[PDB]
């Protein structure tokens, strides 16, 4: 009984690693649209949350499944794999694409000001390298943390999303095995329902 | 002769599709300016009657059509002379020709050669997007093999069908003018009757009444 | 001096030429033939000519074999004919794209290449097959046929791989679209069409 909600702009990369989750696990949630003043909040009954990757691992133990089990928190390695690759999004990744979504999308459309060449220039050279690993990487398995999607995959769907909306969202087209690997997430039921509820 | 009405961007490929075949046979026609793909939301009518929103629209009195190659064909049937036969349809051994070479057109030319069109023109103009230059190489090593076959083609004949031009030629008119505005249209200096044959169909008037019309608005 | 098809009968393409042999009650034999060993699939022989494309060769036939009460192209008819040429398209470009790779996929590529069945592909041919089912079963409410009320070439091309269709495990998806469903059965009703639906089945 009773879904889980969502505080937050539900369009935000915030909300959607979190509605992505749900979603994934087929929790019933509502998300309420709310802009405030950690950019989710999160309440389960009495119990309330902030911050993305938090919210995300809470609902993935939560509603783990002997089927459903992004996490793996039950193989050591299986989720050291999880783990190392979630940090590689959040510490490597993510600091090179997601300038490239805020000067190319939120810059001008909600924060109204230029886009900044200098700054993505110089993120597209770093993202380059960045890819170069994630090449190798899944041309050894279809997914980052062997051959079963986890959130490490899911951590990387809501800035990547909007990075396809740059007009840099070709790139991944030099890299064939990441641009598969990113056609095998842009497929799975889950995203492609959180996807619909982006788009400026 | 009420003229007939054409309704879509005459920059559009099924829009020339269309005029061009209108010019060949010397009709009477007018074309109206509207993007009817641009309006997300339609009237009851639109829908039932295009549901699939298929282009151009067409107007010949009460009749509505839509679909660029139903169209053309209608224009070359309705208009047809002794000297201005695009289809050929009573000489089944000519009208088979122009079928086939409409068929090579539809799912073996323009799907190689179309993509280049997008990604070089229609998207860095009017959508803004960059060229995506993997989709180019994969569609320029397509269209090499298929301009192998009409090099052979076009050094047995003049045109595609045969002696004669028809639908078939016409077809490939659209397309092929955006793709030789830019800068891969020196890839028909490697077949030299592919490129006579295209330089034969520049120089028709009608073509190039309809090339004039192909140009992008200004305001 | 019949004609002569020479194609793997099981072929939509050769399908898609002996069907219209069958409805103009022309004499025509079949050769087995694989002979990609363009490329278009079926070769067709009239004595002193030779076609090849599926869609050229059915026209030919339809053309050559014209009666009154089997004219399958309405080419004395220009409103008739553009129905025809429109439905055709339709085919060529927006039905068979969204259903002939669920044929590969769930037919073909096990049975012929060895490959198993993607279901990434099959989904999102299953999504795009369903928007363009909406259209025909608008369009088979107000006509029996795709042309109007007569049968016509537009209808003996969605044929081949419609048959095929429904020998996958999707065959039910025309169940949801009643007004195409019948349309189907009335196809499937006929006897040109009895005929070249029992030689689609290889062993
Ligand atoms: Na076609
Ligand atoms: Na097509």
Redesign the interface.
Known sequence: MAPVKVFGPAMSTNVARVTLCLEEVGAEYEVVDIDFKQIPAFQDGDLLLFESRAIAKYVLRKYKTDEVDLLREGNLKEAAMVDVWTEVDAHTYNPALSPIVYECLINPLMRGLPTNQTVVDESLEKLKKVLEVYEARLSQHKYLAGDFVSFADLNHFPYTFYFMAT?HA?LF??YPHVKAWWD?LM?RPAVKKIAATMVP
């Open positions: 007009p070709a087209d030099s095998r497929a």
